[PDB]
Amino acid sequence: VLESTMVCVDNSEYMRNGDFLPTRLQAQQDAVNIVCHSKTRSNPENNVGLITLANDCEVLTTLTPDTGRILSKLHTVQPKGKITFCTGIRVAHLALKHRQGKNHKMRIIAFVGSPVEDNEKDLVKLAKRLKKEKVNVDIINFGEEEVNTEKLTAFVNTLNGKDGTGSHLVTVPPGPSLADALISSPILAGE
Amino acid sequence: LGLPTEAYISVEEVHDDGTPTSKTFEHVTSEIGAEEAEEVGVEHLLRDIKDTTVGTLSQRITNQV
Amino acid sequence: KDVPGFLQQSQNSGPGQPAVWHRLEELYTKKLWHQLTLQVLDFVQDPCFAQGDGLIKLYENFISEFEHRVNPLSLVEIILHVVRQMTDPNVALTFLEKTREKVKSSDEAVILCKTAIGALKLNIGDLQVTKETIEDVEEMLNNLPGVTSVHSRFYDLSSKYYQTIGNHASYYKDALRFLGCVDIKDLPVSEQQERAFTLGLAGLLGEGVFNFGELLMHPVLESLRNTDRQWLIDTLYAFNSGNVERFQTLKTAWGQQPDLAANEAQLLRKIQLLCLMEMTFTRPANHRQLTFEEIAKSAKITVNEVELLVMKALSVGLVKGSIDEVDKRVHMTWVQPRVLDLQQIKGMKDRLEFWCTDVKSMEMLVEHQAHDILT
């Protein structure tokens, strides 16, 4: 299936936390490695881009079939500042809209393990906008299993509506590297 | 009543009133100029619009107004 | 291990705060490696640590634990408070040097550490080394971006250093920049009051500080409004709006300040210069010829010294013009731009409207008269 996806990665000050071996930064690097490998093993016409969610809410690499560029760019990353994630998702959606392959299904996957201090009203508003503009999102959460998990579940449900199955959430409690859960998650399972 | 291009260059503004220095856009004199071939092409395009039988004095008075 | 033993024994042996002791131990066991920085910040800025080395031992053990996995900046300010604790400044200076070595990182950490070292050695007494470290700190800071929440400490250090030297102009500049960087609300009312008073004094004594509308409009110059220290704001108004008469009227007031006692002659010349500026600005653009008698009356000087005063004004560059001493007239053509009030802005707007009407009138005249040839 033709898929144009971007990985939003939260790189806040909290991503020097060591709850995932060795540190959340390396766990995130492994997670993006495996997810991008899955994307490549899927329809090769599928393309992947990278967004970093921080005080700057920047876009590292736009849509590109190659993977070494994304891996190097994400390796050249350090944790600083706080996450916004509203900018993050909006900028990601703009990148989706401005993709060379219109036939590619729109996809955003966000690693957002962090405290999301955004009001649920704007969360649901953004969810409704995304779903009505036909972009599905598969959010991944780790670390804070309670602070924001309720908000993320509500966001995913708001995207879902009644049958919008494209929206998904995956929350993983602390443990080993964030690899086994991502492999045995519904997201990559459906790939 | 003006050119279509407005040129700016970012520059740090060290305020004298102690306010924090912030990047700001600074204007730079911009004008339209043409290579030989660009001038030839644009003159061909404007062959029937541009008026050249005006005279230097008339053109300068038009410039004054 | 040693750290588990220390934490579990000091949970009760340690003086006070069992709750945050338990929180720290739970966070360390969870190995999150965050929110413990914030907990230690709160537990270090909480009271009863002054007068004892409990903070020092806490810091030592906690850095021996996790000196590496700490936000450089956070480590730096917790070390700043640790050094606020403890004394015998040789050990403190060596400790700050080791801190900087530990925390070579984003220049905010290093710059704050260097500010701490400069403050420590300035309090010690040595001044040349403070000068060089301040120079290096400013040079490194210039490379940084803008709002970062780290410039305030350096700006305060530079203000204190220049105040200690007596370089009132530089102290004025640096303190005013500090005020701009920091927020008024965070500052207590007492600190705002004292800082505003000292900044006003620096403005008065500044060798090259001739602009005072900006000060009078600065928000921090409002804690002195209903204040006994006020006595500085009335003088500041009388001093900006050149009025030597009101300056001597408040001489009985501002004379008390010891710093403003040996600088009366300096302040006298400064006010006479501002008076020349003010009278020139008040006079229109056509009849801007000043007579020696007028300037002498305005500035309470004599016609034999108004000449030197005017040359000094021209040299410092506040005004532009020439002097005809045969007729004792000071021709003027430009004065330093001055702050304007709303009424003055409105009057300038009316003048601009007149200018625009004239321009439009001649545009129409030229167009109509040359309509035939005009293209």
XYZ file of C-alpha atoms in Angstrom:
631
model
C 0.000 0.000 0.000
C 1.280 3.460 -0.921
C 2.069 5.193 2.383
C 3.469 8.679 2.986
C 4.346 8.771 6.677
C 6.175 11.097 9.024
C 7.544 10.213 12.440
C 7.135 12.965 15.007
C 9.704 12.403 17.752
C 9.511 14.135 21.112
C 13.023 15.143 22.207
C 12.246 17.119 25.344
C 14.495 17.483 28.375
C 12.895 14.296 29.710
C 14.539 12.179 26.985
C 17.683 11.784 29.043
C 15.534 9.541 31.254
C 16.892 6.027 31.683
C 13.686 4.064 32.226
C 14.215 2.461 28.795
C 17.615 0.853 28.344
C 19.967 2.688 27.985
C 18.169 6.027 27.727
C 14.933 7.193 26.143
C 16.996 8.824 23.384
C 18.578 5.525 22.320
C 15.262 3.716 22.767
C 13.641 6.259 20.446
C 16.466 5.849 17.933
C 15.921 2.080 17.921
C 12.154 2.558 17.621
C 12.503 4.856 14.608
C 15.041 2.455 13.105
C 12.643 -0.484 13.306
C 9.554 1.463 12.203
C 11.389 2.907 9.190
C 12.704 -0.565 8.354
C 9.103 -1.797 8.421
C 8.071 1.081 6.153
C 10.846 0.185 3.701
C 9.985 -3.528 3.770
C 6.444 -2.433 2.920
C 5.651 -1.056 -0.553
C 9.003 0.538 -1.496
C 7.181 3.510 -3.020
C 6.241 4.332 0.576
C 8.162 7.353 1.846
C 9.070 8.522 5.341
C 9.941 11.872 6.899
C 11.093 13.111 10.296
C 9.775 15.871 12.571
C 11.254 16.832 15.948
C 8.898 18.171 18.628
C 10.690 20.666 20.872
C 10.723 24.389 21.626
C 11.357 24.887 17.890
C 8.949 22.206 16.590
C 11.148 21.629 13.568
C 11.159 19.309 10.552
C 14.431 17.444 10.072
C 13.955 15.451 6.853
C 10.954 15.712 4.540
C 9.462 12.796 2.616
C 12.195 10.539 1.257
C 12.288 6.820 0.357
C 15.847 6.495 1.665
C 16.459 5.668 5.325
C 20.128 6.424 5.997
C 19.411 10.146 5.777
C 16.666 9.894 8.401
C 18.809 7.723 10.670
C 21.773 10.105 10.496
C 19.578 13.158 11.069
C 17.908 11.562 14.097
C 21.294 10.473 15.452
C 22.351 14.131 15.197
C 19.740 15.059 17.810
C 19.916 16.102 21.462
C 17.152 16.525 24.058
C 16.249 20.134 24.850
C 13.195 22.160 25.755
C 9.553 21.180 26.094
C 7.066 19.691 23.628
C 4.212 21.617 22.028
C 2.750 18.815 19.860
C -0.065 21.014 18.564
C 2.302 22.842 16.273
C 3.942 19.435 15.843
C 0.845 17.718 14.462
C -0.216 20.757 12.409
C 3.206 21.081 10.748
C 3.192 17.329 10.176
C -0.204 17.586 8.473
C 1.076 20.412 6.274
C 3.989 18.181 5.282
C 1.455 15.463 4.461
C -0.515 17.846 2.256
C 2.672 18.977 0.485
C 3.796 15.498 -0.568
C 4.748 14.607 -4.133
C 2.600 11.469 -4.083
C -1.030 12.481 -3.660
C -2.123 8.843 -3.984
C -0.008 7.974 -0.932
C -2.171 7.461 2.136
C -1.433 10.150 4.704
C 0.238 8.959 7.903
C 1.631 10.515 11.078
C 3.174 8.406 13.844
C 4.085 10.352 16.978
C 6.329 9.247 19.822
C 5.017 11.612 22.486
C 6.032 10.088 25.790
C 6.012 13.305 27.813
C 3.648 15.621 29.740
C 1.315 17.128 27.134
C 0.082 20.398 28.655
C -2.430 21.180 25.923
C -6.097 21.697 26.704
C -8.312 18.774 25.747
C -10.613 21.109 23.811
C -7.856 22.025 21.361
C -6.686 18.403 21.325
C -10.135 17.261 20.180
C -10.417 20.169 17.736
C -7.132 19.162 16.100
C -8.242 15.519 16.087
C -11.470 16.448 14.302
C -9.567 18.554 11.770
C -7.140 15.712 11.066
C -9.871 13.098 10.663
C -12.050 15.297 8.443
C -8.959 15.976 6.318
C -8.381 12.193 6.187
C -5.055 11.699 7.966
C -4.774 8.765 10.364
C -2.400 8.929 13.330
C -0.823 6.133 15.379
C 0.396 7.701 18.623
C 3.048 5.999 20.760
C 3.416 6.897 24.440
C 5.992 5.827 27.013
C 7.185 7.067 30.372
C 4.183 8.948 31.761
C 1.585 6.168 31.825
C -0.938 8.345 33.705
C -0.299 12.063 33.160
C -1.250 12.177 29.471
C -2.488 8.670 28.615
C -6.104 9.678 29.246
C -5.694 12.694 26.958
C -4.103 10.582 24.217
C -6.860 7.966 24.451
C -9.488 10.707 24.190
C -7.640 12.214 21.210
C -7.505 8.850 19.430
C -11.187 8.206 20.163
C -12.121 11.650 18.830
C -10.229 10.852 15.637
C -11.957 7.459 15.551
C -15.463 8.891 15.739
C -17.545 5.771 15.106
C -15.568 3.797 12.502
C -12.368 5.782 11.865
C -10.161 2.831 12.769
C -7.088 4.527 11.289
C -6.496 6.381 14.557
C -4.625 4.289 17.126
C -2.777 4.589 20.430
C -0.035 2.415 21.924
C 1.169 3.103 25.479
C 4.115 1.095 26.819
C 5.159 1.141 30.511
C 8.865 1.357 31.384
C 11.055 -1.662 30.762
C 13.652 -2.777 28.212
C 14.293 -0.959 24.935
C 11.124 0.162 23.145
C 11.487 -2.610 20.567
C 9.474 -5.675 21.594
C 6.286 -3.672 22.170
C 6.584 -1.778 18.885
C 7.164 -5.053 17.026
C 4.228 -6.738 18.796
C 1.939 -3.723 18.482
C -1.202 -3.599 16.315
C 0.382 -0.857 14.195
C 3.289 -2.834 12.748
C 1.230 -6.026 13.051
C -1.190 -4.631 10.469
C 1.707 -3.822 8.126
C 3.594 54.285 -7.149
C 6.449 51.936 -6.273
C 8.625 49.050 -7.332
C 7.276 45.499 -6.923
C 10.279 44.247 -4.918
C 10.907 45.156 -1.273
C 14.278 43.852 -0.093
C 15.103 43.104 3.541
C 18.099 41.665 5.389
C 17.900 40.220 8.893
C 20.040 42.011 11.474
C 20.307 41.965 15.254
C 18.831 45.105 16.836
C 20.844 46.165 19.884
C 18.265 48.417 21.520
C 19.620 51.434 23.383
C 16.813 51.130 25.964
C 18.211 47.829 27.255
C 15.463 45.671 25.774
C 16.747 42.240 24.699
C 18.416 42.088 21.302
C 16.170 40.453 18.699
C 16.576 39.621 15.026
C 14.782 42.127 12.796
C 14.447 42.764 9.071
C 16.420 45.697 7.651
C 15.600 47.285 4.302
C 18.129 47.341 1.457
C 17.735 49.440 -1.678
C 16.185 47.177 -4.317
C 15.725 47.913 -8.008
C 14.993 46.033 -11.229
C 17.842 45.448 -13.661
C 18.294 43.314 -16.749
C 21.015 41.419 -18.549
C 21.435 42.182 -22.249
C 19.277 39.202 -23.240
C 16.736 39.888 -20.494
C 16.438 43.479 -21.711
C 16.011 42.281 -25.298
C 13.268 39.860 -24.286
C 11.362 42.291 -22.083
C 11.596 45.006 -24.741
C 10.182 42.570 -27.292
C 7.346 41.740 -24.894
C 6.645 45.448 -24.266
C 7.199 46.407 -27.917
C 3.650 47.761 -28.235
C 2.986 48.969 -24.661
C 6.127 50.890 -23.702
C 6.134 54.382 -25.215
C 9.533 55.501 -26.517
C 8.499 58.506 -28.647
C 8.238 60.663 -25.523
C 11.455 62.675 -25.548
C 14.051 63.040 -22.823
C 12.476 66.213 -21.428
C 8.983 64.703 -21.332
C 10.293 61.549 -19.660
C 12.140 63.600 -17.042
C 9.026 65.676 -16.302
C 7.080 62.428 -15.934
C 9.776 61.257 -13.525
C 9.362 64.468 -11.518
C 5.593 64.052 -11.221
C 25.052 0.437 48.249
C 26.430 3.536 49.951
C 23.820 5.804 48.341
C 20.889 3.539 49.305
C 22.245 3.386 52.850
C 22.665 7.151 53.077
C 19.199 7.880 51.710
C 17.424 5.305 53.880
C 19.206 6.384 57.070
C 18.811 10.124 56.403
C 15.124 9.539 55.637
C 14.684 9.953 59.410
C 18.154 10.888 60.685
C 18.316 13.819 58.274
C 16.757 17.022 59.611
C 13.238 17.431 58.276
C 11.348 16.747 55.049
C 10.668 12.988 55.284
C 8.182 13.400 52.430
C 10.699 14.700 49.906
C 13.300 12.236 51.194
C 10.875 9.445 50.280
C 10.110 11.112 46.949
C 13.817 11.298 46.078
C 14.444 7.674 47.031
C 11.410 6.482 45.056
C 12.455 8.467 41.980
C 16.019 7.152 42.187
C 14.763 3.569 42.500
C 12.434 4.113 39.538
C 15.540 5.332 37.671
C 13.442 7.828 35.717
C 16.356 10.332 35.894
C 13.954 13.288 35.662
C 11.685 15.136 38.085
C 14.486 14.438 40.557
C 16.266 17.519 39.231
C 13.146 19.576 39.951
C 12.697 17.898 43.339
C 16.289 18.700 44.339
C 15.867 22.277 43.106
C 12.785 22.701 45.294
C 14.448 20.928 48.230
C 17.501 23.193 47.935
C 15.585 26.482 47.626
C 13.373 25.469 50.557
C 14.326 26.971 53.946
C 16.486 25.981 56.942
C 19.497 25.039 54.799
C 21.274 28.306 55.547
C 23.617 28.242 58.578
C 24.570 24.582 57.972
C 26.412 22.205 55.664
C 23.397 19.944 55.152
C 23.094 21.394 51.660
C 26.793 20.714 51.047
C 26.569 17.050 52.055
C 23.308 16.607 50.130
C 24.930 18.075 47.022
C 28.076 15.974 47.401
C 26.204 12.685 47.707
C 23.715 13.496 44.953
C 26.399 14.504 42.438
C 28.463 11.454 43.361
C 25.293 9.602 42.369
C 24.187 11.294 39.149
C 26.469 14.199 38.249
C 26.463 12.990 34.638
C 22.748 12.668 33.815
C 21.640 16.159 34.845
C 20.558 19.058 32.670
C 23.796 21.121 32.536
C 21.987 24.353 33.386
C 20.066 22.746 36.259
C 23.289 21.329 37.686
C 24.795 24.805 37.399
C 22.157 26.637 39.407
C 21.964 23.935 42.083
C 25.739 24.323 42.372
C 25.198 28.089 42.559
C 22.974 27.620 45.600
C 25.422 25.100 47.079
C 28.142 27.757 46.812
C 25.747 30.302 48.301
C 26.001 27.823 51.140
C 29.498 27.147 52.501
C 32.355 29.654 52.815
C 36.157 29.937 52.843
C 36.108 31.177 49.256
C 39.274 29.379 48.094
C 37.447 26.043 48.227
C 34.438 27.695 46.582
C 36.530 28.989 43.672
C 38.197 25.611 43.172
C 34.763 23.976 43.318
C 33.381 26.317 40.649
C 36.400 25.581 38.458
C 35.724 21.857 38.821
C 32.055 22.567 38.068
C 32.883 24.344 34.811
C 35.202 21.489 33.857
C 32.411 19.009 34.604
C 29.874 21.018 32.627
C 31.565 22.079 29.432
C 28.257 22.197 27.527
C 25.806 24.627 25.931
C 27.321 27.987 26.751
C 24.504 28.829 29.198
C 25.940 26.487 31.835
C 29.510 27.720 31.383
C 28.434 31.361 31.264
C 26.466 31.080 34.509
C 29.409 29.304 36.155
C 31.768 32.072 35.032
C 29.339 34.664 36.393
C 29.365 32.822 39.723
C 33.171 32.767 39.781
C 33.339 36.465 38.943
C 30.885 37.335 41.705
C 32.815 35.217 44.208
C 36.172 36.803 43.425
C 34.669 40.304 43.321
C 33.370 39.687 46.840
C 36.849 38.399 47.703
C 38.268 41.729 46.547
C 40.429 41.073 43.498
C 39.141 43.221 40.639
C 41.386 42.767 37.585
C 40.513 39.071 37.314
C 36.848 40.023 37.613
C 37.400 42.432 34.718
C 38.928 39.781 32.456
C 36.337 37.140 33.347
C 33.529 39.639 32.715
C 35.059 40.438 29.325
C 35.277 36.758 28.376
C 31.753 36.133 29.680
C 30.305 38.973 27.605
C 32.228 37.794 24.539
C 30.859 34.259 24.902
C 27.347 35.547 25.627
C 27.281 37.655 22.458
C 27.327 34.419 20.432
C 24.178 33.158 22.165
C 20.588 33.647 20.982
C 18.316 36.100 22.769
C 15.749 35.253 25.442
C 17.312 32.352 27.350
C 16.783 33.162 31.089
C 20.569 33.180 31.677
C 21.573 36.766 30.814
C 20.197 38.230 34.051
C 22.944 36.857 36.295
C 25.713 38.263 34.095
C 23.945 41.592 33.732
C 23.647 41.847 37.522
C 27.306 40.856 37.921
C 28.401 43.548 35.475
C 26.165 46.113 37.170
C 27.678 45.344 40.578
C 31.215 45.358 39.156
C 30.806 48.731 37.450
C 29.099 50.157 40.544
C 32.034 49.014 42.679
C 34.472 50.655 40.265
C 32.328 53.786 40.036
C 31.877 53.628 36.241
C 28.369 55.020 36.493
C 27.691 55.105 32.742
C 28.529 51.432 32.211
C 26.667 50.478 35.385
C 23.615 52.386 34.148
C 23.725 50.596 30.801
C 24.188 47.137 32.307
C 21.605 47.550 35.078
C 19.043 48.860 32.593
C 19.736 45.868 30.337
C 19.296 43.599 33.371
C 15.958 45.260 34.085
C 14.867 44.726 30.491
C 15.902 41.068 30.554
C 14.205 40.264 33.876
C 10.519 40.748 34.695
C 9.311 43.310 37.222
C 6.813 40.906 38.791
C 9.430 38.358 39.868
C 11.421 41.131 41.534
C 10.118 41.967 45.033
C 8.850 45.499 45.547
C 11.820 46.324 47.781
C 14.319 45.106 45.186
C 12.524 47.031 42.432
C 12.577 50.147 44.626
C 16.279 49.975 45.449
C 17.253 49.037 41.889
C 15.251 51.946 40.475
C 16.866 54.371 42.923
C 20.382 53.206 42.055
C 19.618 53.217 38.316
C 18.375 56.788 38.630
C 21.592 57.708 40.424
C 23.580 56.052 37.634
C 21.618 58.023 35.048
C 22.328 61.250 36.921
C 26.052 60.495 37.147
C 26.489 59.016 33.657
C 29.258 60.728 31.714
C 27.446 60.197 28.405
C 23.890 59.454 29.597
C 21.907 62.438 28.298
C 18.594 60.693 27.515
C 16.091 60.551 30.374
C 12.658 60.310 28.771
C 13.323 56.591 28.398
C 14.077 56.358 32.122
C 11.027 58.377 33.154
C 8.918 56.080 30.955
C 10.609 52.875 32.127
C 8.064 50.821 34.117
C 10.480 50.036 36.956
C 10.662 53.774 37.671
C 7.205 53.528 39.257
C 7.848 51.879 42.638
C 9.206 55.304 43.635
C 5.887 57.051 42.856
C 4.423 57.019 46.415
C 7.811 56.551 48.180
C 10.166 58.419 50.599
C 13.033 57.384 48.284
C 10.844 59.364 45.807
C 12.846 62.583 45.940
C 14.738 60.842 43.165
C 11.819 60.821 40.739
C 10.974 64.506 41.158
C 14.658 65.345 40.710
C 14.721 63.067 37.659
C 11.851 65.001 36.072
C 13.432 68.354 36.935
C 16.720 67.019 35.560
C 15.436 65.623 32.251
C 13.276 68.669 31.534
C 16.128 71.116 31.917
C 15.211 73.335 34.870
C 18.243 74.418 36.883
C 15.934 76.474 39.108
C 14.087 73.319 40.161
C 17.455 71.556 40.400
C 18.594 74.010 43.076
C 15.115 73.824 44.617
C 15.668 70.089 45.135
C 19.333 70.606 46.071
C 18.083 70.614 49.657
C 16.631 67.204 48.749
C 19.146 65.332 46.588
C 22.127 66.720 48.517
C 21.665 64.133 51.268
C 22.795 61.239 49.070
C 26.558 60.889 49.716
C 27.300 59.816 46.140
C 25.549 62.954 44.844
C 27.637 65.300 46.996
C 31.055 65.442 45.306
C 29.432 65.326 41.840
C 27.355 68.496 42.251
C 29.614 70.363 39.822
C 29.385 67.457 37.377
C 25.607 67.361 37.799
C 25.492 71.160 37.544
C 27.215 71.103 34.155
C 25.043 68.166 33.083
C 21.821 70.007 33.968
C 22.994 73.204 32.280
C 23.735 71.175 29.143
C 20.293 69.554 29.265
C 18.818 73.035 29.750
C 20.526 74.227 26.572
C 19.114 71.175 24.795
C 15.624 71.833 26.151
C 15.491 75.526 25.266
C 16.828 74.860 21.765
C 14.224 72.132 21.242
C 11.388 74.306 22.564
C 12.300 77.144 20.216
C 10.951 76.685 16.661
C 12.920 75.729 13.548
C 13.063 79.343 12.275
C 13.824 81.561 15.295
C 16.264 79.065 16.826
C 18.934 81.717 17.455
C 19.905 81.781 21.137
C 21.449 84.847 22.748
C 24.092 84.649 25.448
C 21.794 86.537 27.821
C 18.931 84.085 27.255
C 21.118 81.035 27.817
C 22.718 82.617 30.892
C 19.314 83.379 32.405
C 18.056 79.879 31.623
C 21.086 78.013 33.014
C 22.039 80.370 35.891
C 25.490 80.889 34.365
C 27.247 84.023 33.105
C 27.737 85.184 29.528
C 31.456 84.436 29.939
C 30.732 80.728 30.585
C 27.761 80.154 28.269
C 30.301 80.183 25.442
C 32.281 77.272 26.900
C 29.028 75.487 27.739
C 27.851 75.733 24.131
C 31.179 74.503 22.777
C 31.011 71.575 25.206
C 27.500 70.790 23.966
C 28.670 70.810 20.353
C 31.695 68.651 21.187
C 29.633 66.026 23.004
C 27.336 66.113 19.978
C 24.005 66.879 21.631
C 23.498 69.920 19.373
C 24.812 71.165 16.038
C 25.444 74.784 15.140
C 27.848 77.684 15.463
C 28.579 80.684 17.680
C 28.813 84.358 16.702
C 30.362 85.997 19.757
C 30.497 89.447 18.145
C 26.691 89.517 18.334
C 26.613 86.948 21.177
C 24.204 84.667 19.323
C 24.320 80.865 19.225
C 22.999 79.658 15.874
C 21.530 76.161 16.188
C 20.403 73.682 13.543
C 19.842 70.323 15.278
C 19.330 68.865 18.753
C 19.414 65.311 20.022
C 16.078 63.567 19.345
C 13.863 63.847 22.417
C 10.913 61.797 23.621
C 7.551 63.294 22.660
C 4.195 63.260 24.429
C 0.854 62.433 22.820
C 0.027 66.112 22.269
C 3.425 66.657 20.644
C 2.835 63.666 18.361
C -0.532 65.161 17.408
C 1.069 68.515 16.596
C 3.704 66.786 14.488
C 0.833 65.003 12.737
C -0.797 68.342 11.897
C 2.508 69.616 10.510
C 2.765 66.459 8.404
C -0.775 67.053 7.140
C 0.186 70.565 6.026
C 3.254 69.171 4.258
C 1.152 66.501 2.538
C -1.375 69.086 1.353
C 1.418 71.178 -0.166
C 2.902 68.122 -1.895
C -0.488 67.145 -3.316
C -1.119 70.706 -4.489
C 2.079 70.805 -6.524
C 1.529 67.271 -7.815
C -1.811 68.445 -9.198
C -0.308 71.676 -10.536
C 2.527 69.940 -12.388
C 0.225 67.273 -13.808
C -2.365 69.779 -15.028
C 0.171 72.218 -16.483
C 2.153 69.516 -18.321
C -0.825 67.282 -19.167
C -0.133 67.510 -22.906
C 3.498 66.367 -22.824
C 3.171 64.394 -19.590
C 3.051 60.664 -20.297
